[PDB]
Amino acid sequence: KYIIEHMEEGFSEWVILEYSQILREVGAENLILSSLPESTTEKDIPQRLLKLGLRWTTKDLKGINEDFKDLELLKDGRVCLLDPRATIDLQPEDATKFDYFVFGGILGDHPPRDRTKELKTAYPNLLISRRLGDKQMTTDTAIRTTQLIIKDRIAFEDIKFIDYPEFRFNKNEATEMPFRYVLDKEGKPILPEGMLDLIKKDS
Amino acid sequence: KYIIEHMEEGFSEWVILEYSQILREVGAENLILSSLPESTTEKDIPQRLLKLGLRWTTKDLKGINEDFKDLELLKDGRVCLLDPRATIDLQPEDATKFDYFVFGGILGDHPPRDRTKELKTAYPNLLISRRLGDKQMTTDTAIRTTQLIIKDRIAFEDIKFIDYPEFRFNTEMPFRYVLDKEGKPILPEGMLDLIKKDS
Ligand SMILES: Nc1ncnc2c1ncn2[C@@H]1O[C@H](CSCC[C@H](N)C(=O)O)[C@@H](O)[C@H]1O
């Protein structure tokens, strides 16, 4: 159901924390990590994700069925590409329309590689583009949101968010995260396990 | 979130494969394995389940919040106990009604111990009982079904099942099973070998 195009070279601690959280919230059978470098083997995947059962592949969108027997084929118009630049928000009623939710992004910098657009250009008949509100989200937030709209059938504007949360570490260090986050029951922003400590040590 | 009451002594390969499948399909965040023996420690929990991030506890329903502060409080009427002898079938619109779905069963045998009744009795105000069809399901199938009804909002009679499938190896399973796209019953990874090995 959820397909993440791996958006970096190697795996930083940050992306390991995100992917870990995603895995524990959707379950390993429901996430495919795709488009990894062609040379990638098991020894290249962080063992923390392997233990959690991460399904990964070097293949791309059209080729993933070749790597997984259980995966229903990719039909035209039933694959939703998620893009903050799209004009139509994802709706609860879309639960019927899509069998796959794809996350692209921007790979690297200097130059950057807009994978979202390249996908859009590679799969003109496959992809439908949808937005998750007018603010930028992290991958685990974007997935949590997709899951809230599609599985819990809650419309976007009924979801409680916080934008640009500020985290205070000491009397000196005040950092602000330039993203929208889903609130938890106690009114605080949901981050992956370990993310907070990671942000702290960055200061 | 799903709460599974651990319904056998120790961990057989059978239940390990069943629990693994569940964890991979719903996510380890969304499952609590409860009511384990008081002596139980992490050392007694199978490694394959710990790697997948199994959340387990010796506690029962009343004390589940104590072990996991991230969980929403259990409120009366918002906890559904899944019971094949119950009267009202679980329906898609119940997705707004419940925060928890509990799976009990029989801690047999000689004598057996019906945890389903024990629960239903120890927590009368807490629990509401729902059925998943008139046939018996494995826990992984019952969770799979609860998920289709609650998360995908698919009605029970619109789910495609197979009743009492036979498996030839050169065996009939007395359960109802959900079908996959390929028309075959959906079993936990590794279960077919274990069924075969037993023959
Ligand atoms: N508001 C929004 N609407 C739709 N998708 C969004 C979104 N905010 C984030 N996303 C998803 O999350 C992804 C960005 S997270 C990508 C991080 C990567 N290291 C990079 O540099 O780009 C996007 O590809 C998109 O799929």
Ligand SMILES: Nc1ncnc2c1ncn2[C@@H]1O[C@H](CSCC[C@H](N)C(=O)O)[C@@H](O)[C@H]1O
């Ligand atoms: N048709 C049905 N309707 C509602 N719940 C069901 C069901 N079939 C199975 N379940 C639930 O799924 C669980 C798995 S059966 C558990 C196995 C255990 N050895 C025992 O005999 O009890 C059961 O506890 C039951 O409560």
